[PDB]
Design a protein around this nucleic acid. Sequence first.
RNA 1: GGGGCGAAAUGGCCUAGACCAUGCCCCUUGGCAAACCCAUUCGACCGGGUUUGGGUCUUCUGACCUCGUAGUCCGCGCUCAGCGGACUUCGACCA
Length: 50
Amino acid sequence: LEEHYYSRKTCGSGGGLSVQRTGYPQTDPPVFKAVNSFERAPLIVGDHVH
RNA sequence: GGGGCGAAAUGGCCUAGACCAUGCCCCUUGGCAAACCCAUUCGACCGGGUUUGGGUCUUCUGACCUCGUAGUCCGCGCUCAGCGGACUUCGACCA
């Protein structure tokens, strides 16, 4: 989205000011590809000293 | 100098008792372990002096290496290092 004021002026008669606000949806490349993973082994043995 | 004692050795007093005389108990603190210096056979030779000695970051409070001292639950499992590991405390040149 991007707004803009197409502010035009008339010929040699009057002299008024018009804002004329308008927007336009603007494209863009995709967002990052966040990655957060983790792999490990299961579980082995209960002994502690070894 | 500083204290202690009437015990403990005896003598006065000496049912008992508490004090006395000589009379006997301690302090004159102590130790650092390293590195370097002189004159010369122009080092061998004993003796002396200087820099360090738990240690840094803000050695201010307070923490970061290390340990020492204790009390408490503790694991009978979860974590890549692994592990046996947790929390709270006081001290840290040496007798």
